[PDB]
Each structure stands twice: as structure tokens, then as C-alpha cells.
Amino acid sequence: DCPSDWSSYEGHCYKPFSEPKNWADAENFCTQQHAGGHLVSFQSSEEADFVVKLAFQTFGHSIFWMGLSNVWNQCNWQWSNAAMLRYKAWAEESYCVYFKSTNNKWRSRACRMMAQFVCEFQA
Amino acid sequence: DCPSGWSSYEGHCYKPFKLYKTWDDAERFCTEQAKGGHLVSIESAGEADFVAQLVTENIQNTKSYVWIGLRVQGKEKQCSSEWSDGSSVSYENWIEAESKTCLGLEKETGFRKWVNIYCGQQNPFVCEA
Amino acid sequence: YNSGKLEEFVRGNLERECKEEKCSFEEAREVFENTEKTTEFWKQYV
Ligand SMILES: [Ca+2]
Ligand SMILES: [Ca+2]
Ligand SMILES: [Ca+2]
Ligand SMILES: [Ca+2]
Ligand SMILES: [Ca+2]
Ligand SMILES: [Ca+2]
Ligand SMILES: [Ca+2]
Ligand SMILES: [Mg+2]
Ligand SMILES: [Mg+2]
Ligand SMILES: [Mg+2]
């Protein structure tokens, strides 16, 4: 059974937070909220639906960090003319994933930016 | 030397187009504008500066984004493969437009920085040969 | 336009973000929440 301030769903515990934090600070904060804590991860649509609803029910319309970071840094970025990728001029260094509390769609945001978030751990 | 309408910079020829095409269409279009043509490849700060100047002088609308040739060559929506809790990323639910695996130049950053944007967006661009 | 603070916590608004301010394709999309509608908008916006 989850802590009084958390919500239970299929054997896991979830809790949304309103403190604006960047991705890294949010993830770190989650590890400190309970043993095995992390930013929420969606292993299925059912789980995602539960979390989105919880977030909206608690704080209304806002954006919430999910547990995915540096999502394109390992991708195979290549120049169409096959030129070697040496020089770099990225406007943003890293992107992270979040959801807007009105639906369960995955969205991207620079990891350095702020957002609310949802923590999760296995009960 | 470069054809009329094209501009020369360190051995290559560049040309901006005020045509709005998706990344794929723009890239294909560029391969037909000159032998060996492609969306521009920014390989140095100087080239980045040369292209920035070319864009400012030819692409009026400062609201537009300008395609460059660097993009994720693969089908992945993300390449992390793992959540912060250590579990694998299987289920996904991206809005395709949120998987910004293409890059464009824009006014706010002086057309010198690469901004992650949706590949299906129709934007003006620069070809290089 | 994105000031870079907490403005994206609130619902999108075409007038505020695209008319009174310059907006990116994505900001418009966060308003319509339909990529095609945003593409139609984009054609007439530029
Ligand atoms: Ca989970
Ligand atoms: Ca080049
Ligand atoms: Ca704004
Ligand atoms: Ca905005
Ligand atoms: Ca917005
Ligand atoms: Ca304003
Ligand atoms: Ca936004
Ligand atoms: Mg107004
Ligand atoms: Mg968005
Ligand atoms: Mg249409």
C-alpha cells in the first residue's frame, strides 16, 4: 500500500509534484522521495492514462517530466552529403520527455528547462 | 566557379530557396539543382557564418526556419532505449512532430545555430554543391 | 515566442503566442494539437 501522499496503480506508487525543476533535478528529487524512486516511466497506455489523470486531478493543466533523457544524443545524426560530423552548432545540447496533463502524448523539451513532474516507485 | 544564382565559399557553391518543402522533399530537390547537390552541410564556423549571411539576405520572412542537411538517419523516435528506472523503452506514444530529428536555422539564433524541429515541416532551405 | 521561463506551463494561445508574438511551428501545434491544421496555418503564417 502506497504512502498517504501517493497513489496506487498496478503494484506501483505515483505522486505528482508542483515544484518547477529541470529534468536532472526532478529525477534526483524523485530518488529521494522513496526507495527506488524515479521520474515516472510508461510501460503501457493504461499506466499512462492513470498518471495523466492523476496529474490533472492534482494540479490541473501543466507539463510533467517523464523518465526519459538525452533522447537523441545517441541517434545516428548524419549529413545528407556524407560529410563527417566534426563541427557542431546545436542550439540545445539535450532533450528530455514530458507529458501535458490534458493527454497521454509524449512531448520533448530541452532538459535544462523547467517543468513539474511525477515520481514513481515499485511498492 | 559557380552558376548564376549560386554563391561561392571555399570551393563549394551555395544557393538559398524561398520554397517551402519537407526535409525529404528539400533534400531531393537539392540533388537535382546541381551535380552532387544536397541540403547544406555546415562543417565549420566560417561556413556557418557564410550560410547565415546568405540566408538573411535571401530569405525575407524572419518567421521561417531553414533546412540544413543534418538529420537522424534511422527510424527511431528516440535513441535512449532506457528509462531512468533502468527498464527498457518498449511502449511509446510520441506525437510525431515532437520527435524533432531534423535541424533548421532560425532568426533568434542568427541562423547560426541548429534547432531541433519536425522533419515533416515545410520550410525554405539552402542547397550546397 | 518562448521567453524561456514557465510560460509553457499554461495552455497555448494563438493570439498571444503567434499574433502578438512570433511563434515557431511547434508553438502553433501546441495550440491546435493537430499537425495538419498547423501545417495549414504555417502556409499562411510565413
Ligand atoms: Ca512505470
Ligand atoms: Ca559543406
Ligand atoms: Ca510567449
Ligand atoms: Ca510559447
Ligand atoms: Ca506553447
Ligand atoms: Ca507576450
Ligand atoms: Ca512549447
Ligand atoms: Mg491580441
Ligand atoms: Mg511541443
Ligand atoms: Mg489540410
Say which of B44, B90, B116 has its CB closest to residue A95. B116
Measured in angstroms, the CA of C8 and the nearest CA of chain A are apart by 8
Note whether B64 contacts C46, CB cutoff 8 Å.
yes
Note whether C10 contacts A61, CB cutoff 8 Å.
yes
Annotate A14-51 with b (16+ C-beta within 10 A) or e (fewer): bbbbeebbbbeebbebbbebbeebbbbbbbeeebbebb
Q: Chain A window 38-57: which residues touch C at a Cβ cutoff of 8 Å?
A: none
- Residue pairs spanning A and C at CB distance below 8 A: 17
Contact B124, B18 (CB under 8 A): yes
Domain extent listing, chain C: 12-45
Give the neighbours of chain B: at least 3 Cβ pairs within 8 Å.
A, C
Burial of B83 (0-12, 13-18, 19+ CB in 10 A): buried
| C26 annotated ligand-binding residue | yes
Helix/strand/coil (H, E, C) string of chain A? CCCCCCEEECCEEEEEEEEEECHHHHHHHHHHHCCCCEECCCCCHHHHHHHHHHHHHHHCCCEEECCCCCCCCCCCEEECCCCCCCCCCECCCCEEEEEECCCCCEEEEECCCCEEEEEEEEC
Tell me the torsion sign for CA atoms A74, B121, B61, B48: positive
| Resolution for this experimental structure (Å) | 1.5
- In this complex, is the C-beta atom of A110 within 8 Å of any C-beta atom belonging to chain C? no
Distances (CA, A) of B72 to A73, B103, B117, B129, C12: 10, 9, 11, 21, 29
| C33 annotated ligand-binding residue | no
Domains detected in chain A: 1-123 (3.10.100.10)
Closest to A23 measured CA to CA, from A61, A71, A57, A85:
A71
What CATH number is attached to the domain comprising B45? 3.10.100.10
Chain A residues within an 8 Å CB radius of C30: 100
- In this complex, is the C-beta atom of C10 within 8 Å of any C-beta atom belonging to chain A? yes
Query: Rounded CA gap, B8 and B22, in Å?
Result: 25
Count structural domains, chain B.
1
Note whether A63 contacts C5, CB cutoff 8 Å.
no
Note whether C24 contacts B61, CB cutoff 8 Å.
no
Give the neighbours of chain C: at least 3 Cβ pairs within 8 Å.
A, B
Say which of C5, C8, C33 has its CB closest to residue A63. C8
Per the structure, the complete domain to which residue B124 belongs is given by 1-129
Note whether C6 contacts A20, CB cutoff 8 Å.
yes
